[PDB]
Swiss-Prot record:
Practical use: Might be a good antibiotic target especially in combination with antibiotics that targets 50S ribosmal subunits (macrolides) or target peptidyl tRNA drop off (lincosamide clindamycin and aminonucleoside puromycin).
Single GO MF descriptor: tRNA binding
UniProt source species: Mycobacterium tuberculosis (strain ATCC 25618 / H37Rv)
Signal peptide: none
Ligand binding (tRNA): 17, 68, 70, 116
Subcellular localization(s) per the UniProt record: Cytoplasm
Keyword Cytoplasm in annotation: yes
One Pfam match: Pept_tRNA_hydro
Family: Belongs to the PTH family.
Factors inducing expression: Constitutively expressed (at protein level).
Protein name per the record: Peptidyl-tRNA hydrolase
Amino acid sequence: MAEPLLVVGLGNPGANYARTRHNLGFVVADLLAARLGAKFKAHKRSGAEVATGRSAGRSLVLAKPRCYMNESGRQIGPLAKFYSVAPANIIVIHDDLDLEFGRIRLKIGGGEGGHNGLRSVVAALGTKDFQRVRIGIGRPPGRKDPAAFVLENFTPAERAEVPTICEQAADATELLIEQGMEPAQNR
C-alpha cells in the first residue's frame, strides 16, 4: 500500500452536457479535487485532465477524460499505465441506470449497466475488476431511449437533490479510500 489510487469520473465534455445524467462522475470528481486542494492539469501524455492529491494518507491521482464518453477507455487505459496503477486500485464514478435515483452503491466488478463509458474502460483495461462508485439516476420513464435519457438534464424535481447526492457520492468515494469494501458500509 505504497501504491497510488486512480479516481476516475466519467462524463462528456461541453457546457450543455455538464449537467446531464451521464456527467455525474465529472461533478463528483470536481468535488473531490476541490476537497483535496487539487487542481486539474491538462495531461497531454494520455489526453485526460489530471489532479493529484492525498486522502486518508493515500496517494491519489484523479482523472476526467477530455473526449466523448465512448472513448474514456482510450484515455484512462494509457493514464492508469502511466501512473502504474493496477486495475484493482482504480475507482470509477459513474451514473447507474440500474440504481434508483439517489442511491449510491459501491462494488468491484459486476456488470456495466448499459453505460457506454464503463464498457469503454473495461475494453481499454481488458478486465472488469476495477472499483465503482455507482450513482443511481433511475430507469427511463415509459417509452424512452436510455442513451438519450442520460444526455438530458435532470428534472427540476431531481436537480434539487443532485447537489446533495453528489456530496454523498464524494463522501462514499472518500470512505472507500480509507477502508475498502468493509465500506459499502453505511455507504
